[PDB]
Amino acid sequence: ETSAVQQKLAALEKSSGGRLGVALIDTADNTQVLYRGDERFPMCSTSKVMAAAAVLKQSETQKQLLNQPVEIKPADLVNYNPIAEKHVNGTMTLAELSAAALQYSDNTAMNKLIAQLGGPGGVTAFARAIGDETFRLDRTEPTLNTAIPGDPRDTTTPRAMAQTLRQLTLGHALGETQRAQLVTWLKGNTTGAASIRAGLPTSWTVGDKTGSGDYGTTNDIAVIWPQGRAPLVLVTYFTQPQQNAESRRDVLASAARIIAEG
Ligand SMILES: *[B]([O])([O])[C]([C][C]([C])[C])[N]C(=O)[C][N]C(=O)C1=[C]C(Cl)=[C][C]=C1Cl
Numbered sequence: 001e002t003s004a005v006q007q008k009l010a011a012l013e014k015s016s017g018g019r020l021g022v023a024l025i026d027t028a029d030n031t032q033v034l035y036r037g038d039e040r041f042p043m044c045s046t047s048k049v050m051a052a053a054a055v056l057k058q059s060e061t062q063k064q065l066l067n068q069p070v071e072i073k074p075a076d077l078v079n080y081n082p083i084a085e086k087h088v089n090g091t092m093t094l095a096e097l098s099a100a101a102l103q104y105s106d107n108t109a110m111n112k113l114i115a116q117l118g119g120p121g122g123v124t125a126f127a128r129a130i131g132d133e134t135f136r137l138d139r140t141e142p143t144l145n146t147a148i149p150g151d152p153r154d155t156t157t158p159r160a161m162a163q164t165l166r167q168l169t170l171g172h173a174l175g176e177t178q179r180a181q182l183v184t185w186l187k188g189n190t191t192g193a194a195s196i197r198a199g200l201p202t203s204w205t206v207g208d209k210t211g212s213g214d215y216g217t218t219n220d221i222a223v224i225w226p227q228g229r230a231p232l233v234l235v236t237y238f239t240q241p242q243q244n245a246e247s248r249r250d251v252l253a254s255a256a257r258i259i260a261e262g
């Protein structure tokens, strides 16, 4: 059966023409509210969180790792390189690459993080090490965004991603300095104003990471601090039937508004 929350989410899904996945964790009582919570969705750029977190984990035993310069060559540039293009024939540190990937969704920066982990499988291995049995990263940017219906590549479920995002930011999957750094990065994201943030009260602090891809795939994952109550974690994934469907960040904002009502 379904609650009124899930009925509202289903009606939003129906009106939108696509497939919506939602997972909310309320850390006050560890309850979850799910909509298609165990179905797989293409993560697209929301996978940048796991890649950055994996490098943070590496830095727990190599304290200066984040400050290590990494060469940016002309040939490294892919389809969206707002920060990395400023450093061609130059360098960016792993911290700078992490900030660029998370806060600007720079795809060259993401590919450097993936390479630092030994390839997409290294990101997946980190996920398994922190108890995420669902996440899989198969490809680099930009092909991880093909988002073909039914394809398990580069997917996770809303429930799994919400649980992991909680572990990474409010829990202790990462060390102290590292989890605080991840929170700082997520809070300063520049690309999320029309997504989850647009559906929540303005007094709430939010850290988030968006993503987008083919099939009009439009995603956001967030850690949320309401004023005067325990924080929440929210995942909103959305994908559509036709390859060239338009982005629908408004659907994510609407899903967040629905979840926040209660
Ligand atoms: B992320 O969602 O992975 C990222 C964020 C944007 C802001 C750069 N998305 C993409 O790169 C989307 N890319 C595609 O849909 C794409 C691009 C290219 Cl060049 C080739 C294949 C695909 Cl699927």
Ligand SMILES: [Cl-]
Pocket: 045, 105, 191, 210, 211, 212
């Ligand atoms: Cl994005």
